[PDB]
């Protein structure tokens with residue numbers, strides 16, 4: 029149900045400060061997931077497993093799509109444009125370049141729309157490879173329903189681009205490797221945790 | 235030893251040269267694509283080959299060897315995310331071939347002279363794969379997508395196999411201890 | 422359970438900066454360089470503190486709360502935890518490393534002239550030299566029957582550096598939370614109205 | 615000790631395994647010439663070489679490269695320029711070798727006796743896992759650094775901080791060693807041109 033995946037997308041666009049910002053960011057993911065058809069019908073254990081397996085790729089996909097508007101940076105939560113400032117301070121320039129060249133610029137060149145992003149995120153959420161699912165068949169079947177619905181949407185809205193569905197799915201490998209590299213280099217810790225630590229230390233040091 | 239990797243690399247280059255339009259790319263870009271792809275291309279082949287084998291991988295290697303060498307978790311990922319999914323859907327050699335060609339034609343590879351050209355060759359392969367799945371399995375309209383959606387698992391299993399030196403560690407501590415002992419016992 | 426943990430991190434960070442400001446000449450460095458030194462060092466400085474604190478305890482570490490190596494091994498950071506016990510804690514115990522010696526080692530770590538982006542690494546090196554000359558003088562006068570003691574102290578710094586790196590890589594502190602508290606945090610979020 | 619440690623110092627993917635074999639053998643020949651190393655149980659000798667090989671190689675090529683303000687000399691006398699490192703994807707780790715090891719060896723004019731003793735200290739690593747008698751390895755380490763201290767005090771009595779300064783390069787060696795394994799520093803720098811040229815040649819005849 030492609031209208032309802034679009035609806036989920038739209039509703040969502042000290043070092044305690046760092047824990048708080050992480051809390052908020054994670055909660056936005058959970059609110060979006062609860063609005064995806066049939067997610068809330070899965071056993072709660074499996075819902076937890078899916079959000080733990082997906083949270084990282086789901087955030088990256090959102091800020092990558094948000095950054096289409098902008099040249100040579102990404103827009104995060106709390107509205108902030110990052111060029112190579114927080115990026116360069118955190119030493120995550122290489123990961124930033126990967127986001128711009130593999131996700132942002134490809135989303136821009138094909139004019140990926142919010143329905144398409146929504147469906148890709150729902151596919152990532154319904155990950156039947158996630159370790160310890162009670163019923164991966166049930167998760168695979170929800171994934172199938174999302175991509176069948178995505179294919180139908182692309183064929184109706186962009187019938188002159190018969191390769192578009194495949195092109196969307198073929199961003200998911202780049203999302204998976206950028207997701208892994210973001211965890212390896214603590215991309216999230218460093219970007220949430222740059223200015224609150226720096227300003228806190230500077231003030232105490234006077 | 236290093237010989238088996240040499241052989242495996244040669245076989246890979248022979249396979250790539252036989253993929254339509256690969257040899258038309260600038261030689262620099264062909265080198266970049268093989269360097270960017272070799273790891274996922276090999277994992278995809280031995281994963282598909284291991285359909286034949288009960289609960290291990292053929293290169294043969296069962297979970298005990300994996301867990302003893304400290305790479306049990308990565309071994310389980312290969313069986314559950316690649317081997318068993320290839321088995322359950324009866325992925326055929328044509329489908330594996332097209333998936334490997336898609337991996338080879340990776341337009342994200344760093345330093346390509348013309349990534350648009352590589353994306354266009356990728357497009358030609360997956361259009362051809364879609365046509366094949368639609369004709370051979372017309373009662374499975376989700377099959378094309380299901381094939382493409384093994385490529386994220388291949389990407390992460392590829393990265394984890396490099397990180398943990400999966401293949402080196404499967405050789406074990408004994409051969410390396412033996413190699414050092416032989417060096418030590420020189421005059 | 423999780424708010425308690427973010428609070429104790431706040432406290433621990435405050436304590437670190439108060440300690441650094443009391444190290445001779447630290448506060449004379451350009452503020453940018455002071456920030457760089459604390460960002461480059463905080464991890465090894467904390468590991469050194471809890472390692473020395475843990476001398477009293479068998480096969481766990483005291484934070485400031487006891488953590489036993491069972492929690493480490495269950496959370497899958499067992500090997501890094503055992504490196505803390507065998508490479509730092511037990512060596513600190515066997516040589517009876519004292520608080521002056523730990524202080525000097527931490528001051529050496531703080532004054533790291535390798536830290537990237539220092540305006541004047543030569544100035545940081547010169548402060549490091551003053552600390553280790555002062556440590557050597559202390560070891561020679563307080564323990565003159567142990568001529569190897571100064572060297573033994575400095576030769577724990579490689580183990581601190583590798584343990585520090587491995588603690589970041591494998592998210593040692595996050596993983597010591599356990600899976601159950603994070604699963605409980607997500608379950609609470611999922612059950613909100 | 616110190617005269618004999620100085621004496622030890624002074625003495626197509628197959629082609630990359632061959633160069634690694636040679637490089638590793640040079641390490642083992644050097645270790646066998648360190649006093650009392652060959653008296654250790656053979657198992658412990660293997661454990662010490664497995665635990666040390668990486669830091670022992672980095673220390674040697676770092677000291678060798680004192681001559682050069684660019685790059686590193688790789689035993690044969692072959693210069694590897696910053697650009698080859700950055701092109702082969704290990705630029706960051708290469709800059710860490712030049713700034714934290716090479717330039718600091720140059721600033722203090724570390725001599726071959728001092729390098730020999732540092733390498734002997736690294737070899738006699740009592741933290742190495744599974745040693746039959748770590749106490750025996752610790753005692754050999756202590757004898758090396760006592761001997762190094764006596765050498766520094768006699769040869770450089772005007773530099774009282776020299777012994778400490780030598781030992782304080784060992785943390786940089788440990789972190790650069792770990793980063794060299796993570797990024798396959800050795801494979802990539804020995805291996806970059808040999809693979810690229812091999813592939814280009816095979817790719818050129820249909």
Ligand SMILES: CCOCCOc1cc2c(cc1-n1c(C(F)(F)F)nc3cc(C(=O)O)ccc31)C(C)(C)CCC2(C)C
Nearest residue numbers: 046047050051054080083211212216217218220423603606
């Ligand atoms: C379900 C797992 O958490 C999902 C979102 O991430 C966090 C969440 C939280 C945290 C950190 C993070 N956190 C963060 C953060 F958002 F930057 F803080 N990055 C993380 C990386 C990993 C990992 O690489 O395995 C794990 C957790 C990370 C802390 C530990 C701050 C406590 C509050 C919670 C639960 C909100």
Ligand SMILES: CCOCCOc1cc2c(cc1-n1c(C(F)(F)F)nc3cc(C(=O)O)ccc31)C(C)(C)CCC2(C)C
Nearest residue numbers: 217218221225426427429430433484588589592593594595
């Ligand atoms: C009591 C221990 O004292 C503090 C130890 O350090 C941590 C502590 C914590 C955390 C992270 C870390 N932590 C860690 C960790 F080691 F990976 F856990 N990496 C961090 C990076 C930053 C940053 O780049 O700004 C900030 C904090 C990081 C999280 C965010 C997991 C919350 C809870 C606490 C205490 C465990």
Ligand SMILES: CCOCCOc1cc2c(cc1-n1c(C(F)(F)F)nc3cc(C(=O)O)ccc31)C(C)(C)CCC2(C)C
Nearest residue numbers: 236399413631633634635637638795796798800801802804
């Ligand atoms: C220029 C440096 O030369 C010494 C390298 O040591 C080796 C030695 C050997 C090998 C690999 C390596 N080898 C190499 C290498 F040199 F590129 F070859 N890098 C290695 C990394 C690890 C690790 O991270 O755990 C382990 C072994 C590694 C192989 C295992 C392939 C077979 C036997 C030998 C002798 C050749």
